Amino acid sequence: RVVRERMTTQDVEAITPQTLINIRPVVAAIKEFFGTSQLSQFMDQNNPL
């Protein structure tokens, strides 16, 4: 969505993939899955079983 959104503004033949790509939502999606989700749980360490 941000790729299209800042693809329309910027001048063509002056743009490049590292000017189109914003990786912050991908980073935040993986981070908020691994912390604060129901299926990413604290490991049960009482014994090996």
């Binding site: 001048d11 002056a14 490049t16 993939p17 590292q18």
Partner: protein
């Protein structure tokens, strides 16, 4: 025109070494492509040989070009519009043209105005971009020791 090993200048990205010439097929015809290895962000640019002049790829300039850009870089009476947006669009469309004279004009205007006051985030970013592609094109034009070419540009700017 172009040969493998030539150092051509791409418009918005500065220097570019022509490292190979591909022969890709689009719509059943072998429009040959040439691959360029620029080093600003480490991107490989591929263009047809037909639309090289259409996109405005350009060889490096000679010593008449060097004295011409120094002559325009040491020139007064460079009155600018006082509006910040007008000025920004003006030297941005000067920077996007790909001419060494226009890039030297942008770096001298922003260098004198930064020596005056120190402008802004956007204008310091633009001055960094313009001065780095001017330094790269000068070092391509004389094979003259990167960052010592930066000292050369600083010396001829300060005068």
């Amino acid at each position: 025109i172009f040969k493998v090993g030539d150092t051509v200048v791409y418009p918005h990205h500065g220097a570019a070494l022509v490292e190979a010439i591909e022969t890709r097929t689009i719509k059943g015809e072998q429009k040959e492509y040439l691959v360029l290895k620029v080093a600003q962000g480490d991107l490989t640019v591929r263009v047809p040989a037909e639309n090289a002049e259409y996109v405005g790829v350009r060889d490096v300039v000679g010593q008449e070009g060097l004295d011409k850009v120094f002559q325009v870089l040491r020139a007064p009476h460079t009155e600018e519009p006082t509006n910040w947006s007008r000025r920004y669009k003006a030297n941005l469309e000067k920077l996007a043209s790909g001419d060494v004279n226009k890039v030297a004009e942008v770096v001298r205007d922003l260098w004198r105005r930064d020596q005056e006051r120190g402008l802004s985030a956007g204008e310091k970013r633009m001055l960094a971009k313009a001065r780095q592609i001017l330094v790269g094109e000068l070092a391509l034009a004389e094979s003259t020791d990167d960052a010592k070419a930066e000292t050369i540009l600083d010396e001829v700017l300060a005068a």
